Nucleic acid binder design. Structure first.
Lengths: 158, 197
RNA sequence: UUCAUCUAGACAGCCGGACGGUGGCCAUGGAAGUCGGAAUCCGCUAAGGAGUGUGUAACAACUCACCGGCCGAAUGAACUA
């Protein structure tokens, strides 16, 4: 067995195009159709929002593994109707994600992160949400981060 | 400027009267992921404070009045060196510090960490790179379209900065011997410094 | 003349790095810190800008700001005549 590693940025729960699948995977004797279907299955919850999908090619099995992306996870929690490219381009996002949810994403992302504290990882994910530009608990992630820094949002550090 | 000067001085003071022992860690040739990872491993156990030699020297000279020990630490902070404060067993702190070492590739004009040889093995490339092989005068024959170095050659070693030629040779050889990592010059402990060794 | 930087190391040069999350999101035909659009996000920070630019279809990759090491005491800018 050979330990191979390959990912992409195919859009979540949207069948991946063979023109964007074959060049990467096609060489190493692996079905692009299988890759796309597995990506969609793993992004069932992620449908519409693009997600990075690690593939461990251990002797030619297209076993997709969605790696948690902070921003995309934030949008999945934002719960906006799956982005309809057809109806309008560049669909904006305004999700009301609760502090509990942003903390949850922080716990699900700390694993591969570098934030000193759980509070630090929450600030990171909140900065990602700020980049997205949505309003969060009827407030901007910037002011939520400043509140955490100034010791207002008591974080459940567990 | 003076405000952040005082802030840095205060942080050094805090560590100096909050951590029983410290190590003098050299960060030469060391990337940023290195000391990030080292801090991650040391989290809780040790803290890392690195900075400007003159900065730390002046801070130490200004703390001399209250701490009459550190005049012996003054002559040890030279080059890219900082201080890893801790209250934990020196040995394990040291190995955790010196363990995280990333095998970076052999780059041009980069002092070789160790005696990089060209150890004979069926490397698997072609006359295009045999050009470089001959350029550095290593007898190499095209074995079934896969080069083999007949004779080992002492190309580079500790120091003797790796010229573009050797750098390219080792890159095509796909060897990353430049396992950069934070070193340790000396060890301060309860007002007593001793070498790492 | 006025305003600044500066032995708590000023400018120049050389050398080493210049991050994790993160190839960030959005997309751009293709952008991978940088044709690109909003914010210049958090952490680690000496430093690192979702980056300073280059390069590439994109890359891979460099490079600069930036930070260190050396160096040793001056330096920069706008003005006046």
């Amino acid at each position: 067995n050979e330990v191979k590693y390959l990912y992409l940025r195919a859009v979540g729960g949207e069948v991946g195009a063979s023109a964007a699948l074959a060049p990467k995977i096609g060489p190493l004797g692996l079905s692009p159709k299988k890759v796309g279907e597995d990506i969609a299955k793993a992004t069932k919850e992620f449908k519409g929002i693009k997600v990075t999908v690690q593939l461990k090619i251990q002797n030619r099995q297209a076993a997709a593994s969605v790696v948690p992306s902070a921003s995309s996870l934030v949008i999945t929690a934002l719960k906006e109707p799956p982005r309809d490219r057809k109806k309008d381009k560049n669909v904006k996002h305004s999700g009301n994600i609760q502090l509990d949810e942003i903390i949850e994403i922080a716990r699900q992302m700390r694993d591969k992160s570098f934030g000193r504290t759980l509070a630090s990882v929450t600030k990171e994910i909140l900065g990602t949400a700020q980049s997205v530009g949505c309003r969060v608990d009827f407030k901007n992630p910037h002011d939520i981060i400043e509140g955490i820094n100034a010791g207002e949002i008591e974080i459940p550090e567990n | 400027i003076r405000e952040k000067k005082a802030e840095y001085f205060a942080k050094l003071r805090e560590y100096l009267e909050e951590y029983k022992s410290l190590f003098v860690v050299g960060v030469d040739n060391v990337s940023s992921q290195q000391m990030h990872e080292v801090r991650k491993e040391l989290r809780g156990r040790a803290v890392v404070l690195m900075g400007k030699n003159t900065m730390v020297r002046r801070a130490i000279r200004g703390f001399l009045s209250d701490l009459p020990d550190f005049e012996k630490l003054l002559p040890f902070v030279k080059g890219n060196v900082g201080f890893v404060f801790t209250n934990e067993p020196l040995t394990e702190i040291k190995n955790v510090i010196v363990s995280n070492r990333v095998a970076a590739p052999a780059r041009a004009g980069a002092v070789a960490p160790e005696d990089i040889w060209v150890r004979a093995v069926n490397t698997g490339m072609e006359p295009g790179k045999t050009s470089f092989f001959q350029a550095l005068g290593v007898p190499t024959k095209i074995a079934r379209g896969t080069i083999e170095i007949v004779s080992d050659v002492k190309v580079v070693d500790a120091g003797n900065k790796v010229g573009q030629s050797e750098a390219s040779l080792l890159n095509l050889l796909n060897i990353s011997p430049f396992t950069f990592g934070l070193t340790v010059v000396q060890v301060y402990d309860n007002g007593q410094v001793f070498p790492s060794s």
